[PDB]
Enzyme design. Sequence first.
Site, mmCIF file in Angstrom:
data_model
loop_
_atom_site.group_PDB
_atom_site.id
_atom_site.type_symbol
_atom_site.label_atom_id
_atom_site.label_comp_id
_atom_site.label_asym_id
_atom_site.label_seq_id
_atom_site.Cartn_x
_atom_site.Cartn_y
_atom_site.Cartn_z
ATOM 1 N N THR A 194 9.235 -22.432 -15.853
ATOM 2 C CA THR A 194 7.817 -22.720 -16.214
ATOM 3 C C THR A 194 7.689 -24.179 -16.602
ATOM 4 O OG1 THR A 194 7.496 -20.472 -17.189
ATOM 5 C CG2 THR A 194 5.874 -22.180 -17.761
ATOM 6 N N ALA B 139 4.670 -14.031 -20.952
ATOM 7 C CA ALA B 139 3.629 -13.813 -19.957
ATOM 8 C C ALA B 139 2.449 -13.019 -20.501
ATOM 9 C CB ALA B 139 4.217 -13.100 -18.754
#
EC number: 3.4.25.1
Lengths: 212, 241, 243, 198, 204, 245
Positions: free
Chosen positions: A1, A49
């Site tokens: 990420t 998430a």
Amino acid sequence: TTTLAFRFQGGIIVAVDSRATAGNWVASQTVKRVIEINPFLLGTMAGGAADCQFWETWLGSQCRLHELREKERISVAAASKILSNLVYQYKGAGLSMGTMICGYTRKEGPTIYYVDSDGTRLKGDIFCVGSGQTFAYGVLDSNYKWDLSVEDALYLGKRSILAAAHRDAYSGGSVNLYHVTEDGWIYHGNHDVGELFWKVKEEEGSFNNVIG
Amino acid sequence: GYDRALSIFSPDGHIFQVEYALEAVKRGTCAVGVKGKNCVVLGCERRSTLKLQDTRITPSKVSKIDSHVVLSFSGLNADSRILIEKARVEAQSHRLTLEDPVTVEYLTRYVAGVQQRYTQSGGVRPFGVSTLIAGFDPRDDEPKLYQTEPSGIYSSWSAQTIGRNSKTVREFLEKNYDRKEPPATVEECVKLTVRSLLEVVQTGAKNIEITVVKPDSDIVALSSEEINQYVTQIEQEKQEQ
Amino acid sequence: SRRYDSRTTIFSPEGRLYQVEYALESISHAGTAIGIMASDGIVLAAERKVTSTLLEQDTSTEKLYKLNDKIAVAVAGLTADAEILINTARIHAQNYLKTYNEDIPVEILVRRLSDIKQGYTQHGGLRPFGVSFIYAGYDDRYGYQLYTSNPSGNYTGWKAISVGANTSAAQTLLQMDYKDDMKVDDAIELALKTLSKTTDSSALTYDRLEFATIRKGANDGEVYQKIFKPQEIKDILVKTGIT
Amino acid sequence: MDIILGIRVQDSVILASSKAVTRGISVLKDSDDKTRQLSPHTLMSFAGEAGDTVQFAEYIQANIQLYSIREDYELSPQAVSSFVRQELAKSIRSRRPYQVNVLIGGYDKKKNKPELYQIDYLGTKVELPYGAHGYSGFYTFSLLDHHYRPDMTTEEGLDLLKLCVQELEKRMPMDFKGVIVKIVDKDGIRQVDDFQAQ
Amino acid sequence: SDPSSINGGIVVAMTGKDCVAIACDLRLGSQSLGVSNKFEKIFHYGHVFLGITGLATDVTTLNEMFRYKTNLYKLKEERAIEPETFTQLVSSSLYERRFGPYFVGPVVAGINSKSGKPFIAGFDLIGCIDEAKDFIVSGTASDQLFGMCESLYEPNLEPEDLFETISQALLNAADRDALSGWGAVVYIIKKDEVVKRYLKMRQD
Amino acid sequence: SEYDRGVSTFSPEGRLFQVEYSLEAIKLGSTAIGIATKEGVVLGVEKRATSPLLESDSIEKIVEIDRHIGCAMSGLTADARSMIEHARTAAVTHNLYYDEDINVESLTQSVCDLALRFGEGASGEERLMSRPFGVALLIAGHDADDGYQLFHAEPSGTFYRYNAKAIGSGSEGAQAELLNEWHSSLTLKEAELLVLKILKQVMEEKLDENNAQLSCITKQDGFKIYDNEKTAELIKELKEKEAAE
């Protein structure tokens, strides 16, 4: 990420990748790492998430109640506070999430507040959270200038995520861009990292050690 | 009769117990709020009638809620002290959960919220207080002035008064205060607040409290002399015509 | 018939709270108590009401109490209602000391108490305190201070106050002779020079009194609080106008 | 850990507090202010665990301020630090304790004397002429044991404090990104934005 | 790491002809780092003295807990609490927290204003009481004290000789304890008059 | 004479007078009017201020529940603030759970399931609040399933849907007039002058854009509360047609 955001004359620039991975396999290259809290605020997505997605969408509802009551736009500071407060309540329970709340109100101008599950709430100009944060910071640190054009401010954010994408195995896919203004945010598309690389290498000369 | 409880409607749709609470506000001394266009001024009267008591720590009727907001009342004294406390705490809790300090309406709303909460279930009695909340929101320059009643309703005003003989002072204000053009000077905005009480004060500036509040958390009480410096200048043009 | 005085939870058509007013009426049935401010001290004088030949009174007390090591109060009204308060009044006083590691300011303590009395006036199933109080104390904020509080929950600061029976008289006499600077030994004087005039008994007998005072100076950079003994009284009483 | 220094002089207290903020591998900021003014003449620096740190600071600040408008009187350094030690004291024995260490330095307009209280997350409080939290002490305490004098001028203290920092830089592994200094006295708080602008 | 040895410190009490003595060091430090040399472990409520060792944050809290408590006592009984009546208290007190104890080792010591007899007592963290006619020790250098007291103690010393014996015990154990020192203070308690003294000792 | 003192007491003919009186509390409010048109829905109210020193906008008689639902109340104001608050939370929450807009009637529904919480005693569950709310509601909104809808909420706990309705002191004459005016093919501008006309009629004071508030809601822009200049000229433009016929 690899997610990032920063302030400047034009306002705020937000950029993210879209890779999500399970162990060593790429479970998905189509993640929306930008939570559109509401027309005027955006939150990024690092750490967890779901935790990011869930609470930030919750936060949006909160801003809505607040605006109906006061008949006025909620401030980035008050919004970021609300979030971190709810987060702090669950300190210990195991939440997980690094994030950038980005807004641009009339009184406070363009503001970025980094917020995470530890209970941290930081005000800033440049933030990068992720597994590629270190790489993004590179391109960014050396080129940032408060007087960046809008066109270039977006290209900077793009090239930055790209740098990560290439080196950090856990980052890649397609970059997503947003620009936040005193009237709200504007989406600036989704560019596939696959294609963008070849483009940049070719039009910038950079990325020499890559044969292609 | 139907005026015995808070939980009973009279045939015509009233709730007298709450109404009677208001009859007590009229008992208390007079308070008057007057806003300009760069300030807000609150004024009161001192129950100077039975004194051989201290002086030092004598209530001013006006109290600060936050650095930028003051509140004044009329009615059951003891009842008033709790609302002032509760609103003070809330004012600090807001900063704790939202960084930003409260807005004048958010406070007024919180107060009236309480006052209404005390007219819900029975085995509770409505505060016998009516209040005037004045100040300026954070980083804002538009003067604000609200009033709250024992029933729970709140309202904003260009100028307003509550307490005994508030009908009179109100008449006065009405034919003097220009909606289209508010007092543009803190000095004249005071002058106007003073001259209005000077119809129920029963002579002397020893019966008048004045507090002025401007933007940027800048608030300031007035002294006995300063206050008289106006009783003076208005006692001139009075017979001057 | 039909009246609006059946409870505390009810406003009369004119916004009166009778039940509270009646409690305020229970005070005029208590022994007179006085408090007088001074340039260097505060005096507390009371006049035991209850009486009988065989009633121990040289040991135990009934009207004067120590709340803090720097604050004292004169009681007047319902005996039991008085202790309930006095105790909590003492606990609160110690929590302030335990939290700020400093002694609790007078007005704060008087306000805390008035705030409880206030509360028993607004909630159903509760009966207001049938007590009145004269607080006399000292703190570094405002030097010596004299405060008073009633059942309605309001409080105020006098320079010389009286509560209890014949308050009209006692109040009047004071209003007259009180010299604004008056030294202590003149207040203790004026104490009896008022209590006397407003009694009944053929004669004002010592065993029927309670005095206490608060003094301080450069010497003990702090406050000394004294609660006179039956002795000192029977004595200082003669030094004035009693055989 | 972070850097937290403080020293009381003739008539004022000085507080030093590193500026960096680090999350794991990177440094998200090099201009953080670990201070937070409780009242016109009381200042409190802090350093500890990530989230716990400022949630607590603000909480304390809110209580003091509340007390101050209510009483309209300003709580004293001594009583302020007492309140803090009370909270932290209760904290240590609760489902989850705040891990925060602090320094409180105010000016007692009543005695006209500056006072500096040092408190650690356990509720351990002590009044000192100078103090520091965490590892910060080992590199400085000796220099201050050597030069400190109670008669020192505000002007002299800074010079001293400068030395301690220079030492912190030379022998400390972490790069704290400099410090921010602040002075408390009869006239209130001001920031020596010239130890940074130097 | 033992919670009762982070901060360090020592306290000792003795009895003599119509008097008692209570003494302690002054150091408060974190582990090896010495933080203060003005940290006193001996407090008093009326004519009753209490010295406390162990975890500093608890030492402080207890003092406040007992001050608070004793003031309420005096007010209610119209008299100051006595040494025994007090010991019983701090014992129950410590115990009400039997499953999350304060990490201390108190030591009461005073003279009974009625009888006129000397009193000294010790307790462990959960409140077990312990009277003794000779001496009480508690702290990090706990053993060094038992060694000094079990030699230098002498029944019925005169207050002037007690001061010398007690001081010497404290002084010398604190020298063989790495976490106790930086000064000391000793009290000599009689029916009336109480004399307090600070001693000179190595500052290492 | 004897059965009207308990909110949980049936009169011999099965009636709950306290509830009825509740309603009688609304008649005291000033008039509120709602007219629905295939073009959108309109809400207008008489402000009625005691003094010229009041700030008009201080009197929130028409408010927004959500971007697609607005409303006008009549009766006890404190009691209103509470319903308006619940209603707003109801909307927002549903949004959160479904990522969509709450059906106008399903919202109206939750508002009534709230008034349904009166009564003190303890015969099982628990709903803390002594008596009925003293207020009614005109909820104008719009959703993809049934288009522009207009509702009337009563403290009784029930509600009906209307094509046009009026509440408050004047609902007597106002409702009569509306009965003889409303027709399915009314344009929005047409209904505006109608709501505006009926107020002036059964209102009282000279109808100025200060004692009369007007609002409306549409699919296109949601709930908007007409500013003073607009309403002002809508009044002139109105009062004019009166000359001829």
